[PDB]
Write a protein that binds this ligand. Structure first.
Ligand code: ZN
Ligand code: ZN
Ligand code: ZN
Lengths: 134, 266, 46, 33, 65
């Protein structure tokens, strides 16, 4: 506890003392091109391009989203989207490499101009560790 | 009897005030601690959520199901999943509880330590029963829910001690004191004017002969007679948290002899 | 048996695929949540 | 008689639905009281 | 935000004592100070637990799906 740092009862931490939740929200939309050229929320693969991601796309259903119950982690993809240009250049959204957790709530709405707008939200519980501040 | 005697002052179902006499402080503490953290218990340690709409998030709930004390009378005849051979777990190493709640009432539906349902065969043995001391018999309010909020889990209690995690603790507090009239001078009271005036004397000041000036400093003074009090949570009976304490600490000291043994051969 | 999406306000298991409009069969409320997974998720209990 | 642009409106103001709404109204609006 | 099960400090079960305390106040028109001594919560580590808990969960439930 020397030098402006403290010792903290472990048992207490176990029984709960100071745990907390932590949410983060990744979001995305289906771009558009004046001349009817749109992106799409799907679970892509080969199809020429490969210019995709490195993380497992599997956790992805087909609308290009994860189920609200899934446990994610590394750079697993959380959103599958694709860009059409001349055939499968990827535009998916991986989870912040540093963080990891559990999907907590997806939702798909329409954006003013009627485009597919979506937000994903991962939840995590962070327990007090040795480097934490109080 | 023979060595370090006891002499239970008060006593109940949730506490065992007693006097540990003719012992070494070391031993007294050793036991003190063993009680606190190395006595095997039983608690939910794995939770498989199938459905949840409450406001409390999955793990939030899980965490709790851990502290919900469970019956651990015969815990000493159940096995540490880790030592059992079943790929993962079995009736021989664990208990399986269940929980399913639905808000029917138009008024906040409450989920309790009672609604847990053992599913695995207890091959006949007191173990896995959501310990209840609640007056209305519901114990530990797991969580509340609205209209159509559901919640379906599955639990898997296993052995385990406190070092591994708190939920397996059975003690929870343990009064410990000795030499109420600072006679060995193990402390140096802080004060403004008077030690005696400012510093409250304890219940145990009685059970021991006050100082009385004149006399020189008793430096040969050792330290026996400890006024303890092992409360309990339930998982195991107050008396147990003390006997099993006295035992485990013993088996522990045992293994050290045993180890010294295999050591010889090679 | 089975679903897919839901309505934020008028909680009602909906669902549809590509270009089937992103509204609810009742409340316009162009929201829509994605309901859990059938996959069972497990948790450490400490 | 004529439409000219949009005025972002401060919340809980006069011209804001939430303004007059009450306990129950909000919770139903999801908006926290 | 639901009653903490057990006391952060000593671990003494405390999940049950919620409703009871809430009544030894409302109905039994008693004072917190002892309403707790009532529930058996001796030393502060536990007292502080109930005395302070803020059962937000209710306010949460009053929402919807
Ligand atoms: Zn087994
Ligand atoms: Zn709707
Ligand atoms: Zn306490």
């Amino acid at each position: 506890n020397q030098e402006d740092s403290m010792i903290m009862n472990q048992s207490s931490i176990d029984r709960g003392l100071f745990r907390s939740l932590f949410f983060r929200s990744y979001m995305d939309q289906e771009k558009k091109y004046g001349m009817s050229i749109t992106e799409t929320f799907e679970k892509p693969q080969r199809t020429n391009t490969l210019r995709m991601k490195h993380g497992t796309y599997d956790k992805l259903d087909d609308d290009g989203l994860i189920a609200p119950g899934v446990r994610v982690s590394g750079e697993d993809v959380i959103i599958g989207k694709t860009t059409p240009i001349s055939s499968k250049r990827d535009a998916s959204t991986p989870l912040r490499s540093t963080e990891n957790g559990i999907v907590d709530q997806v939702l798909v709405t329409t954006n003013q101009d009627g485009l597919k707008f979506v937000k994903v939200r991962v939840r995590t519980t962070k327990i007090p560790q040795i480097g934490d501040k109080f | 009897e023979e060595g370090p005697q006891v002499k239970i002052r008060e006593a109940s179902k949730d506490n065992v005030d007693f006097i540990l006499s003719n012992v070494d402080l070391a031993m007294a503490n050793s036991l003190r601690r063993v009680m606190i953290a190395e006595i095997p218990t039983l608690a939910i340690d794995s939770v498989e959520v199938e459905t949840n709409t409450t406001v409390l998030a999955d793990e939030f709930i899980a965490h709790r199901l851990g502290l919900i004390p469970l019956q651990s009378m015969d815990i000493e005849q159940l096995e540490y999943s880790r030592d059992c051979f079943c790929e993962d777990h079995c009736d021989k190493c664990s208990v399986v509880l269940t929980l399913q709640a639905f808000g029917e009432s138009e008024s906040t539906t409450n989920v309790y330590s009672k609604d847990l349902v053992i599913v695995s065969n207890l091959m006949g043995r007191n173990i896995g029963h959501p310990i209840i001391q609640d007056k209305e018999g519901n114990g530990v309010l797991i969580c509340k829910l609205r209209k159509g909020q559901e919640l379906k889990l599955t639990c898997v209690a296993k052995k385990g001690i406190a070092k591994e995690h708190a939920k397996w603790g059975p003690a929870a507090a343990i009064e410990f004191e000795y030499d109420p009239w600072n006679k060995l001078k193990h402390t140096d009271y802080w004060y403004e004017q008077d030690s005696a005036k400012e510093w409250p004397q304890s219940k145990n000041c009685e059970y021991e002969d006050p100082p009385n000036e004149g006399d020189p400093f008793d430096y040969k003074a050792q330290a026996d007679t400890f006024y303890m009090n092992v409360e309990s949570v339930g998982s195991i009976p107050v008396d147990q948290v003390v006997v099993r304490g006295i035992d485990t600490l013993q088996k522990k000291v045992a293994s050290i002899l045993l180890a010294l043994t295999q050591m010889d051969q090679d | 048996a089975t679903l897919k999406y839901i309505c934020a306000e008028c909680s009602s298991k909906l669902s549809l695929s590509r270009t089937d409009a992103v509204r609810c069969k009742d409340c316009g409320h162009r929201i829509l949540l994605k309901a859990r997974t059938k996959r069972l998720v497990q948790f450490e209990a400490r | 008689k004529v439409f000219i642009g949009r005025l972002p409106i401060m919340l809980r103001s006069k011209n804001c639905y939430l303004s007059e709404a009450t306990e129950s109204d909000l919770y139903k609006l999801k908006e926290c009281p | 935000m639901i009653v903490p099960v057990r006391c952060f400090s000593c671990g003494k079960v405390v999940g049950d004592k919620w409703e009871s305390y809430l009544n030894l106040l409302q109905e039994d028109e008693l004072d917190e100070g002892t309403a707790l001594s009532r529930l058996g919560l001796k030393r502060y580590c536990c007292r502080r637990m109930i005395l302070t808990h803020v059962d937000l969960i209710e306010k949460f439930l009053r929402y919807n799906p």
